[PDB]
Design a protein around this ligand. Structure first.
Ligand code: V2V
Ligand code: V2V
Lengths: 228, 237
């Protein structure tokens, strides 16, 4: 069993529901996952305020895949992931070989190739990240004023999503973490990295952007029009 | 004295059936290099605005300046270097052999292929270079940043709050830049990807100036589609 977890639990209307070429970003994203028959369930987690509106939007764009379920998101991004996990466990349980492909609702340009690679690398190695090589030199700062270090750019990668995990592995490593450890995370693959278990790399795409600021939405509107 | 070093070097010899190199390709009917150069021209603080370019492209650069009626005597076209930092040092050697280097000189280095920098960015670079001697133009990382030493598996995922996308300009006190460059071995030089790591390898500080999300580097066709959208929708306004 392969499960898809569309993360839309973050807070005009929230960015995930904004129109990209007369169509909510969430719909753009979800269409990619619908085309993959391998998914047992495609779960959209969203704030309680926006659950009925999400289901209205699905209806409005004539999407009625019974594989789709809308559930309530979490405190933080990782908590939303864990809510989707708890939903799967309390409705059909967790096989010890099940994987979940978590993906940002605001990353509507992921590709069929990206998803299929994610699922096969999760089946093989248990934890997967979607990245692209750093184009900018990457810099670090421990004070937001002066540089701390400038690593070898060759070893730096822009982390995207999907991020796909073995559900048992993800739950066990999340339980290993403290509340302080959890609070400093920014993605889900550091759950696995912090517990000293491997994370394979899948290559994303340069156009697999996160659409949150208005600048991003103009880039996304150009990517749509120019068929990128 | 404050100097601008527009980096348009390292363009390899190319056949005529390939489009023009990225620095010279048209963006809204204007070479990207000209878009970049216009911002520096508007700043009177600069004693010279030096464009370094491969030997093959010097005459074409000067034709291009003429074509867009650019006749600022502060602009000079010189031959670039073997690598990016070598191009910077060529600009330094030009400055020193034409005006000398005063100990209060700063140079504002910038990729010709980042045409969307702003007046704000350049001014902050100049003055932060005067105060702290070395400056990087960066933006807070939006993606989580990851490291891998084998292109297969992750080694580490640092705290994103401390990670930054390095952009340009990069601005230095010229003597400081020269001294720290002279300290480096050829191996160290070969592994650098920017100019601020010259200063960082020699354990001297580098101040941070915040850039802009549209201060993108135009190299791939994808970037040119993004850059045409930035132009059309007036997002650098
Ligand atoms: N309580 C919450 C908060 C947010 N969300 C969803 O999560 C998506 C991204 O959220 P956001 O746009 O704000 O970006 P983040 O700072 O969280 O980092 C992400 C970054 O790490 C990653 O894309 C990649 O880079 C790693 O490889 C959005 O769809 C939100 O709806 C959720 O479901 N519940
Ligand atoms: N012999 C050479 C080689 C390159 N150049 C110029 O350098 C510009 C960018 O070059 P390139 O697009 O190829 O990318 P780089 O690998 O050099 O990285 C840059 C990255 O570090 C920086 O933008 C930022 O991210 C860090 O803060 C281009 O205008 C080239 O003409 C030169 O004049 N002479």
């Amino acid at each position: 069993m392969k499960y898809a977890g569309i993360l839309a639990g973050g807070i005009p209307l929230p960015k995930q529901f904004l129109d990209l070429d007369n169509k909510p970003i969430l719909i753009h994203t979800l269409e990619k996952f619908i085309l993959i028959n391998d998914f047992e369930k495609i779960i959209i987690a969203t704030p309680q305020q926006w659950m009925t509106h999400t289901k209205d939007t699905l209806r409005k764009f004539k999407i009625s895949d019974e594989r789709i379920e809308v559930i309530q998101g979490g405190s933080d991004r990782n908590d939303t992931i864990m809510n989707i996990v708890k939903h799967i466990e309390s409705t059909n349980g967790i096989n010890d070989d099940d994987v979940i492909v978590t993906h940002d609702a605001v990353r509507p340009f992921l590709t069929h190739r990206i998803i299929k690679e994610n699922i096969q690398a999760a089946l093989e190695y248990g934890a997967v990240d979607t990245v692209i090589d750093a184009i900018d030199t990457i810099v670090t700062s421990k004070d937001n004023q002066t540089i701390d270090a400038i690593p070898v750019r060759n070893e730096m990668y822009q982390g995207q999503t999907p991020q796909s995990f073995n559900i048992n592995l993800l739950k066990e490593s999340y339980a290993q973490l403290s509340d302080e450890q959890k609070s400093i995370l920014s993605d889900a693959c550091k759950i696995i990295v912090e517990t000293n278990k491997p994370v394979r790399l899948v290559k994303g795409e340069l156009y697999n952007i996160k659409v949150t600021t208005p600048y991003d939405l103009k880039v996304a509107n150009a990517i749509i029009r120019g068929g990128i």
